[PDB]
Every structure is written in C-alpha cells, then in structure tokens.
Ligand binder design. Structure first.
Ligand SMILES: OCc1csc(-c2ccnc3[nH]ccc23)n1
Length: 154
C-alpha cells in the first residue's frame, strides 16, 4: 500500500533551489519540487513534469539520488518518494499562487523551515551520496522512527 511521488532538487555547486509551498500538503515549508506520478507516465517523466508545473523550469536528464518511504501514523498509504537531482535547467524560477522559489547558498539551507527528515538526508545529497530512507511520522513534526542508508544503486 504505497503511492508514487517525485521530488526534484536543482542542486548547483554553490546553491540549491527550494520552493515555499503556499497551500496543501507541506504548506509553509521549503522543499524541492514534486508530486504524484500519473497513470501511463514513468517516474522520471513525472518528476520532470512536476518541476515544470511548480517552478517553471525545464530539465533534461534527471539523476536518481534517493528513495524515501514516508509513513504517517493513522494513514493507510505509504508515500514512496523518488528523489532526483539536476544541476542544469532552463528558464527562470517563477513565483505562482502555489509556490515561491528561492535560491539558497549551501551554508544557508533553511532546515528549521523544512520537513524535519531533510536534516538527515539532505547532507548526503550535498556530498553526492545516494540513499534509501524510511521515516515514520506522528503528525507533520515528530519523527517516531527512521532508517537511512547509503546505496550505490537507487
Ligand atoms: O511529492 C513530494 C512529497 C511527498 S511526501 C514528501 C515529503 C514528506 C516528508 N518529508 C519530506 N521531505 C521532503 C519531501 C518530503 N514529499
């Protein structure tokens, strides 16, 4: 019982693009760009589509960097998030009614205003490591248990 989601991090040598979600699931937190994968669409195609919808950016090749499964206690469906990175995009980040994008220097990533699990795996992403993670949440703020391991093949 898991649902497929994507997450895209535009990660350049000295900065990363995050977006402040304005409403819905995850509102009020900085994050990468992503969402549900649709019928008849590959995971990577869904990731590329979500980046365009939410940031206005066009990406060619995405690189698989991680998979994180999220459990929210009391909710039946696990969220199976496939995480991708790119350093090459086209277009300018656009603010919309749904999303406010902003570039961050790697030393100033706003972990206090992000999902709490990001503090665990984002540093692996910054050092170009790949990972498999599982996080059990109570509500949206409390990590009850987790696992996180580096891998060679996502
Ligand atoms: O569709 C994207 C999506 C679904 S669930 C989720 C998520 C849940 C909990 N912590 C998180 N940190 C970064 C992303 C994330 N992102």
């Amino acid at each position: 019982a898991s649902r497929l989601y994507t997450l895209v991090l535009v990660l350049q040598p000295q900065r990363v693009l995050l977006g402040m979600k304005k409403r819905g699931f995850g509102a009020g937190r900085w994050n990468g760009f992503g969402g549900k994968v649709q019928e008849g669409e590959t995971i990577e195609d869904g990731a590329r589509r979500e980046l365009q919808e939410e940031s206005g950016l066009t990406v060619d090749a995405l690189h698989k960097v991680g998979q994180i499964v999220f459990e929210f206690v009391g909710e039946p469906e696990l969220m199976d998030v496939h995480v991708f990175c790119t350093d090459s995009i086209q277009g300018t980040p656009v603010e919309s009614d749904e999303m406010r994008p902003c570039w961050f220097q790697l030393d100033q990533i706003p972990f206090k205003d992000m999902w709490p699990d990001d503090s665990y795996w984002f540093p692996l992403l910054l050092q170009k490591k790949k990972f498999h993670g599982y996080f059990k949440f109570q509500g949206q703020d409390t990590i009850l248990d987790y696992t996180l391991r580096e891998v060679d093949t996502v």
